Amino acid sequence: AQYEDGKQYTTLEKPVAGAPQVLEFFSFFCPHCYQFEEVLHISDNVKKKLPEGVKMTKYHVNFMGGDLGKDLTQAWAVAMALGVEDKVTVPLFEGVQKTQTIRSASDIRDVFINAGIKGEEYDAAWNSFVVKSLVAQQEKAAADVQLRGVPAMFVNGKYQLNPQGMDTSNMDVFVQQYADTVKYLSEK
Ligand SMILES: O=C(O)c1sc(CCCc2ccccc2)nc1-c1ccccc1
After folding, report:
1. Are 30 and 151 in contact (CB under 8 A)?
2. How many CB atoms lie within 10 A of CB 52?
3. How far is CA 32 from CA 95, 99, 118, in A?
4. Residues contacting 18, CB < 8 A, separation 6+
5. What are phi and psi of 52, to 5 degrees?
6. Neighbour tally for 24: CB within 10 Å
7. Tell me, what DSSP letter sits at residue 5?
8. What is the total count of domains within the chain?
9. How far apart are the CA of 123 and the centre of ligand 1, in A?
10. Is residue 44 classed as helix, strand or coil in its secondary structure?
11. Is 32 close to ligand 1, i.e. is its CB under 6 Å away?
């Protein structure tokens, strides 16, 4: 067929009950994730093709970058709690990988301050149990799919995107094939 289990996607042996509809995992330490977000804009092109009533979830992971990787997962939780993802995604990717000016939790915090999140608002979120819960949520979803690498994307806790089994020749073609595959999967 045109879409095949094992080709553009794979099928989890242990499907995940109740998982988010479209679930993306990334790390601000992950160079391929930088490309996905800054150059390919995968998340946004997937969204632009998703059926109505399907929501996209994006979680950070701990397994890259050691101590700072874990701080970034907490900072992504802060970004979600405040709803400022679109304000800090780029400067976090660039601070970690382009300028390499993010070396500590304080440098992470500076990015939010520079984006206009007030210092008191960031600190209260950072220390909140709402944020502790979002951290564990991100960790649980990654654990549930036994996530070893990023970037990754899952649909309905059943299908894992396989960007290698796609037509990877052209890149704009690549993005749209990735996005059409997610649409197809979300329609199964
Ligand atoms: O598995 C993956 O992550 C992907 S994604 C992709 C196509 C993206 C092209 C591109 C454009 C701009 C910047 C970076 C990359 N190819 C692969 C691949 C991986 C292992 C072996 C062969 C192919």
Report:
1. yes
2. 4
3. 16, 17, 31
4. 157
5. -70, 145
6. 22
7. B
8. 1
9. 37
10. helix
11. yes
